[PDB]
Amino acid sequence: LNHVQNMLEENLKYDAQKYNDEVAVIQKTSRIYKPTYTIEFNREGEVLVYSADPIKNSVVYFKYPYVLYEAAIPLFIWAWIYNPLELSKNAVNSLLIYPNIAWIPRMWYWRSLQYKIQKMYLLRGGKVAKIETQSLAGDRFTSWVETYQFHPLTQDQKNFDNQDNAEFLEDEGQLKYELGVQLDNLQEMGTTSQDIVINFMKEGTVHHPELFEAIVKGYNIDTSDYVINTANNLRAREGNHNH
Amino acid sequence: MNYSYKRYWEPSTAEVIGLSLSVNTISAALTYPIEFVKVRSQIRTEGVGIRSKNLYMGINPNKVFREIHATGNGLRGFYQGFESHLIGRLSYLFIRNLTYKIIYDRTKPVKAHNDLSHREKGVIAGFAGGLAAFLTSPADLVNTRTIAEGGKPKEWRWGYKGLMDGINKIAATEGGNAALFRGSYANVLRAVILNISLTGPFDYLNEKIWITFGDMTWNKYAALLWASFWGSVATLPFDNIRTRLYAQNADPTKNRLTYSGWADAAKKLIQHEGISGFYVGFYAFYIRTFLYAWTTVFITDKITSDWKRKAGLKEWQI
Amino acid sequence: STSTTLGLPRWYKRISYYIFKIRYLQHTKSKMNGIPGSTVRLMLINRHFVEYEVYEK
Amino acid sequence: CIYQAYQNPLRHINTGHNPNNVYEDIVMLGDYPVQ
Amino acid sequence: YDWRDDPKVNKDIEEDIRDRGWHPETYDFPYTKKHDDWVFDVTMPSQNYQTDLTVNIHPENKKMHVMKQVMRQSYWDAEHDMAHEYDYESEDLDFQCESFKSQHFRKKGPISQYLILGLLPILYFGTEFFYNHYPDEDYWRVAHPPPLDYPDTDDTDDTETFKDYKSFTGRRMVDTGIVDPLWYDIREGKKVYYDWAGVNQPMEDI
Amino acid sequence: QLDFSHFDKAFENKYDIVAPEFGDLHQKRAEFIAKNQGTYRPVPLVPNNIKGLIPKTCRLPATRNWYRRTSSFERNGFFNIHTPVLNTKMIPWLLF
Amino acid sequence: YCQMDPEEIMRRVPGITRKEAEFITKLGLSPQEQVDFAYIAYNIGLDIFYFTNQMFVARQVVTNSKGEKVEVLWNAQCYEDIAQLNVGFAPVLESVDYHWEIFLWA
Amino acid sequence: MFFELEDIKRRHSLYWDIYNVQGWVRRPDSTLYNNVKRGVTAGVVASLVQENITALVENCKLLATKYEKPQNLRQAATFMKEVFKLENYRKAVWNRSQYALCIGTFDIGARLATFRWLNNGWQRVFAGFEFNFVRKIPTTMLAALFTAPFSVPFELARMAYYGDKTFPKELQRGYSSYLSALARIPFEEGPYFLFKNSFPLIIRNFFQTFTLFYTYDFLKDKASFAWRVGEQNEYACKMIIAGISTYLAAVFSYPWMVTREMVDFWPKVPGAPCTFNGNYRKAAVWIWYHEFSGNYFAGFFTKYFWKASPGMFLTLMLADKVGLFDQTTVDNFGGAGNNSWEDTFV
């Protein structure tokens, strides 16, 4: 097979070899942001930048078009039971497929509800962001992501917004609209996934707007001017209203 | 089984000669490259033997074929010496078939459903094959030398460009007609062994599988596989010794490992490599013999069945 | 054969869990040391097809 | 024990324990140590 | 030394890629060689960049290194193992020496017999049925219907059945359909089964 | 020589090459590939101006995907078949 | 690969060393697990720079009540099955040695 | 008498058994002409459909690489309309239709003909399920091995033809079409140019044909209880069985085809020898002995599944329709079923 010559294959092989030889694990980035004010980190060496209760602030039960999807199950059940169309055995049995597939979109919506960030922290060095979220069943998932892997989207959520000049924070510091950011690589439950979109709801307080914007735009934060606040206010498995 | 034979129709001598010549011609034309690869593998392994371990023990026929093709000669490079090989095979087949048919006609049983025992048939076939191989030895020598030229260093090559050219060069440069019969004893031994180690196992397994599964069509080909395997097992050492004797150049300095005879070559092979060294190129030899036997049997059976139907024999008599 | 426990049959303590995790990650790195990275694999898969008719855009 | 002598017939009373062709009994047949 | 046994000099030795970096002949028995240690610079840099704001690590750009083949099991040395296990009868004392090298280690050997091991079910069933012709010599043979009126009329009844089918009663039964149509025809001295009967023709009497 | 301590050319196994294996044109193509493996990048011909279509001048976000992938890739080259996507996708099948 | 700050790790565990903190950060653990592992290692004296094998899974140096520093090695263990236990004498995970006599000297 | 080996012909006496059915009886429709005709028809149709699908998918990908993919139904409709009118799409359709005609006649037709030849006589059990299916395994294996290398020359010719179009004018052969390239390559580069290093294609074809034909034949009889007792839809059951068969064939065939990427496309470590020494067989052995399946199962669908599975599914359906999987079933207590009628009612 190799004896067959194809310039496209040769170009692909050359591109792969050149990439492997040139690009290394270590990379140089000049996107460094120096905050004006000193950063007060928690007792754990982290600074909280975002907080919200997406499950509390979202619609769970009566959601469109999932109500429409689930309202047709009785119709199919009645049609199968009474055979109003006078169908054959297999034809009438074919009507029982819909009840087994109508609830899947609601399951996917409930799963997506757990990708709205509940809590966001920036670690020492301004290179790691910890995002904590929860599922509708109360399971809590926390994941650490490097700041460079964030990419904000436009308000319409259909395109990548310019990282440098992005207008998603109001003058005071809060979000104009529910922000969306795509993480190139997300490690969730010890499994790496590609191009995962997460959301910050507009109905959520934003702490340290400068740090939040820097993390969103992917800049590495300079944390040289820092202080440590020894306050043990948060307990393990602490309760919250995101249930 | 002594009355299980059905010899209700026997071809004439001229028909046998013509059919054998044509079928052997096409079979040799088809299967020559495998023999070429086998000879090249034997030459390249001569003096070293098998040094791989476990599953890699041996020489890869595909590797040898790829190396030969990489020389730039294409597929025509695998047919070098094909003229000499075909001439030698034709002469051997003609002589062997003539002698075998003459003896068989002389000593045949009267009854049509009775046939000579396997022992007697093997004795006659071995005698005929030995005589034919002794008569036609120089052609095999020329073909083997032409094949080994590529493997050997340029200075050791003979540069034969045809059967007659090689015969003349051997007669003149080496001196005398005796130089044309080098390896004749080895060729005779190989021919006798191959003749006696093919007809027996084939019938053995064919009858056994017929008894087991009754009358079917795959029985003939399964028996052919078995017979080819056992014939290769029996004959490959003799073929290797014959190849070594043929490749032995006249000049000892040219020779990498000089030999004085069949026994001397066997002793040298045993010394410089284990007994397994007798079976280099076994896969190539097995493939060659099986393909040749299959094509020959298929064509001969088709033609013979057609002739029998024309004559008017019953379905079972065919 | 290689034992799956790596010498730590039970994670009775978080220290044992950490040791097992460290050695497991090292072993996985060693085993994956001989295959291309995610980017290379993805680009090769995406641009595998090379059979077109008209060129010179 | 074929073409290679490993055991010691001096310390072995009988060399017929195992097949071989390189061992011979020190006290051969017809040999009788008598005071 | 012999170059014929050296893969580097002898090109006829087919190197096994799956055994690269492993030499069974060099094992210790007991094995006391370290071939694994901390490995970095593959995906995790060996240098420090935790506080480097101008450097971001991209694990995706993993440079390709030499494949690490799984360790090969030890291969037996016939002469060494035979000498080690050999014990002199009335010359050796019955004891175990202090040295641990005397432990009898298991080393893999030729793999040819394992082919027969893998094929054993096929071989065993063939020996049980085909070689012994169990239950009988006819079960595994291709089935052929008996020839016409063979071996006897009482058993075959071909002619009587043909007459019955050709009779008025046979035609009426076929019309009722409880009895299927005739499956054979009596030709000039031979019985030929119809192609729709789904059976082979009777074997020739010779 | 008879001694096997050192290799000798008498046992050399290298068949002489007389011409390119697949022809002079194939040899020339191989040389051209070696010389310009990456510098020559032919591309398929596609129209550059389509009314209805919108040119693809940037990378699109994941929100534009009609289908959601199940498997994934670790950054070290490992291929993950078991993912949270698979975990959520297996619920209906297991239930049924 | 989200390596935590070695200075922060040292601050959270005052007595740990910069080299140890950097090595822990290099180790592929989430920052919380890195901090916890650093705390445990400093508190026990465990030498994190030890490549675990099938002989010993870790080593530590501890000063006993007599003032002497002694080395403690954590043996590789098995779940109630010596047959499953790997009896080896090399820093290797692979089970290379096969013993016909489990108790050579009885 | 003719050469060294003698094909001894022997006569045997009569033998018969109680039952004349459920063994091997060659079907009357099993002939060289009829089997070849049916196989050629089915293979040609399946290859045409598969090649059209592949051309359409590849042209859609090519258009999407330069224009944003559809955002809604109207955008998808206009995208398909603009794909259909591409000159590249039309040329690819023509050339790949020629390639389908060639391969489906010489590869899929050969596979179907050999399978029918070696498996037509296996009768089934009346009012029951065909047991002793192991007898069919040797036949399917023989057919798969025999017909495995019948597609490698055509595939290599296609690859050479497509790779010639991407070379400069000076170094371009200038093949008018796929048929012209196929006719010219044997005389220009030589026959071995279409067979060198063919192990990946050969093993792929072997696994495909074996695990497709044998699995479909096994399932269509063993799962027949669904429509024989459960009164399920026979056509739907057969469609499900064909889908399972084609999926299994793709799964068992793709890993062997992955050797192409590992040996040729994976980057080479500078200063070190090739991991597999450039041997596809050795790479396949390494894949077979590899611990993790996902590593060589990556790219299963984006690369091979949609280029192979639909063709195999259509081939199975057409073979079933024509009757290449139809066995003969007769009652064992009928007139021709057994030679002992005295105990069929007593």
Ligand SMILES: CCCCCCCCCCCCCCCCCC(=O)OC[C@H](COP(=O)([O-])OCC(O)COP(=O)([O-])OC[C@@H](COC(=O)CCCCCCCCCCCCCCCCC)OC(=O)CCCCCCCCCCCCCCCCC)OC(=O)CCCCCCCCCCCCCCCCC
């Ligand atoms: C320890 C072994 C244990 C047993 C296992 C065996 C293993 C063996 C291999 C491994 C070990 C190493 C070898 C040891 C061998 C030991 C035995 C021995 O001595 O054999 C050597 C012996 C000879 O080998 P060699 O020493 O190499 O000598 C041969 C030369 O290389 C030949 O040189 P060349 O090729 O150059 O020849 C040219 C040709 C030159 O040609 C000439 O002869 C020229 C002169 C005559 C010209 C005229 C010819 C006729 C034509 C004219 C007719 C008249 C005119 C007609 C009309 C006009 C038209 C023609 O010469 C010949 O024809 C042949 C040489 C003799 C010529 C002298 C005259 C002979 C007259 C009688 C024969 C006549 C017919 C010959 C042809 C055959 C029939 C067709 O070979 C064998 O015996 C072969 C192997 C053994 C075969 C038998 C099987 C034994 C084992 C059975 C199974 C046991 C199982 C149980 C275990 C038992 C353990 C004990």
Ligand SMILES: CCCCCCCCCCCCCCCCCC(=O)OC[C@H](COP(=O)([O-])OCC(O)COP(=O)([O-])OC[C@@H](COC(=O)CCCCCCCCCCCCCCCCC)OC(=O)CCCCCCCCCCCCCCCCC)OC(=O)CCCCCCCCCCCCCCCCC
């Ligand atoms: C022509 C055949 C036609 C086809 C039919 C064949 C049917 C065969 C039997 C089928 C069923 C079992 C098949 C097992 C095959 C694989 C065996 C295996 O694991 O590889 C060897 C393997 C050695 O390789 P390894 O363990 O991987 O690594 C160590 C190294 O090899 C290095 O180890 P090392 O340092 O110890 O060096 C010595 C090594 C180097 O040699 C080799 O590896 C050469 C290749 C293996 C040859 C094995 C057989 C040798 C002849 C044994 C004859 C009896 C002992 C007399 C002295 C023989 C001296 C040669 O030799 C051995 O280790 C072989 C020892 C064999 C002992 C045999 C007696 C054990 C007691 C009987 C138990 C089984 C009873 C079954 C029947 C029950 C009926 C109710 O040793 C074993 O696992 C021992 C297995 C022992 C039992 C099975 C084999 C004996 C079967 C005898 C015939 C039974 C026939 C019954 C039906 C017909 C009745 C008429």
Ligand SMILES: CCCCCCCCCCCCCCCCCC(=O)OC[C@H](COP(=O)([O-])OCC(O)COP(=O)([O-])OC[C@@H](COC(=O)CCCCCCCCCCCCCCCCC)OC(=O)CCCCCCCCCCCCCCCCC)OC(=O)CCCCCCCCCCCCCCCCC
């Ligand atoms: C004997 C009977 C014969 C019958 C007739 C047979 C005739 C021949 C049929 C031949 C069919 C060939 C199909 C080729 C498809 C090639 C796709 C491809 O390249 O994929 C590469 C793709 C990766 O591509 P990529 O470029 O890397 O993607 C990156 C993008 O960022 C990510 O991608 P993206 O988000 O940008 O995606 C763009 C999107 C293109 O963008 C759009 O979506 C625009 C169009 C919107 C409208 C969508 C369809 C509307 C309704 C019409 C449906 C017509 C279907 C016709 C074909 C049916 C058979 C496939 O393209 C796709 O992803 C695929 C679209 C294709 C349609 C999929 C939905 C089909 C629903 C069918 C419902 C039933 C219809 C019944 C009709 C009546 C007659 C039967 O990977 C795959 O191959 C994965 C495919 C996975 C498919 C299955 C997913 C569900 C799995 C769960 C199990 C379900 C099955 C259970 C077992 C059942 C059997 C036992």
Ligand SMILES: CCCCCCCCCCCCCCCCCC(=O)OC[C@H](COP(=O)([O-])OCC(O)COP(=O)([O-])OC[C@@H](COC(=O)CCCCCCCCCCCCCCCCC)OC(=O)CCCCCCCCCCCCCCCCC)OC(=O)CCCCCCCCCCCCCCCCC
């Ligand atoms: C039965 C229990 C009853 C009591 C309850 C007990 C509690 C529940 C059971 C225990 C927990 C099981 C958890 C399983 C899921 C684990 C996570 C996962 O998604 O796995 C992917 C994971 C690979 O993901 P990864 O780690 O990301 O891969 C990275 C590398 O590629 C490294 O990859 P690699 O080198 O390991 O290669 C992976 C490759 C190689 O995998 C294998 O070859 C493994 C063995 C497969 C064959 C045996 C299973 C049965 C096959 C079908 C038999 C026909 C009838 C089926 C229905 C009735 C019988 C169940 O597998 C795959 O690529 C996909 C495998 C199939 C995944 C199925 C996803 C759904 C799992 C949930 C249960 C589904 C039940 C429906 C029926 C089963 C559908 C598969 O592979 C596995 O964990 C292997 C196991 C896969 C599922 C089978 C094991 C459970 C069932 C055992 C039944 C044994 C008897 C069957 C007799 C059948 C007679 C006809």
Ligand SMILES: CCCCCCCCCCCCCCCCCC(=O)OC[C@H](COP(=O)([O-])OCC[N+](C)(C)C)OC(=O)CCCCCCCCCCCCCCCCC
């Ligand atoms: C220490 C070594 C000493 C060596 C020298 C002294 C001893 C020599 C011993 C020689 C033994 C030869 C055995 C031949 C093979 C027999 C095998 C056998 O019986 O198998 C059973 C079978 C029995 O066959 P069957 O005919 O009974 O029927 C088989 C079918 N059933 C079983 C149903 C009856 O025999 C064969 O198949 C034999 C086939 C080969 C026959 C030919 C043998 C060689 C003849 C050579 C003739 C001369 C050639 C030219 C020589 C020129 C130079 C002089």
Ligand SMILES: CCCCCCCCCCCCCCCCCC(=O)OC[C@H](COP(=O)([O-])OCC[N+](C)(C)C)OC(=O)CCCCCCCCCCCCCCCCC
């Ligand atoms: C038992 C009593 C007899 C007397 C005592 C025993 C003395 C004789 C001992 C002989 C030992 C075996 C020697 C051959 C070993 C071959 C090993 C091997 O496979 O090498 C690799 C070779 C390599 O062959 P290759 O070169 O084709 O390589 C292909 C393999 N790859 C792809 C991996 C490279 O393999 C073979 O040839 C396999 C078949 C071997 C068949 C050996 C038959 C030996 C028969 C000798 C006597 C003649 C037959 C008599 C009986 C039948 C006829 C009546």
Ligand SMILES: CCCCCCCCCCCCCCCCCC(=O)OC[C@H](COP(=O)(O)OCCN)OC(=O)CCCCCCCCCCCCCCCCC
């Ligand atoms: C777990 C293992 C066992 C699996 C179950 C097997 C059950 C049957 C026994 C077979 C044992 C060997 C394996 C062969 C499998 C494939 C062939 C097969 O199964 O044969 C059956 C079939 C004829 O059977 P059929 O006529 O359909 O039976 C009903 C008739 N009313 O025959 C055919 O289709 C023709 C096949 C011809 C070739 C068969 C070769 C078999 C070789 C077996 C090993 C022989 C070893 C001999 C050793 C000798 C030592 C001196």
Ligand SMILES: CCCCCCCCCCCCCCCCCC(=O)OC[C@H](COP(=O)(O)OCCN)OC(=O)CCCCCCCCCCCCCCCCC
């Ligand atoms: C065959 C028995 C031996 C084999 C192993 C059996 C294991 C049993 C484990 C329990 C779960 C499986 C369900 C039971 C077995 C299959 C159904 C069966 O036994 O057939 C009979 C059943 C009911 O028919 P019945 O009413 O009894 O017929 C009287 C007619 N007057 O007929 C039906 O209703 C048909 C139902 C078929 C379901 C098959 C499911 C298993 C096969 C693999 C999965 C197939 C998935 C795709 C199915 C597509 C169907 C269109």
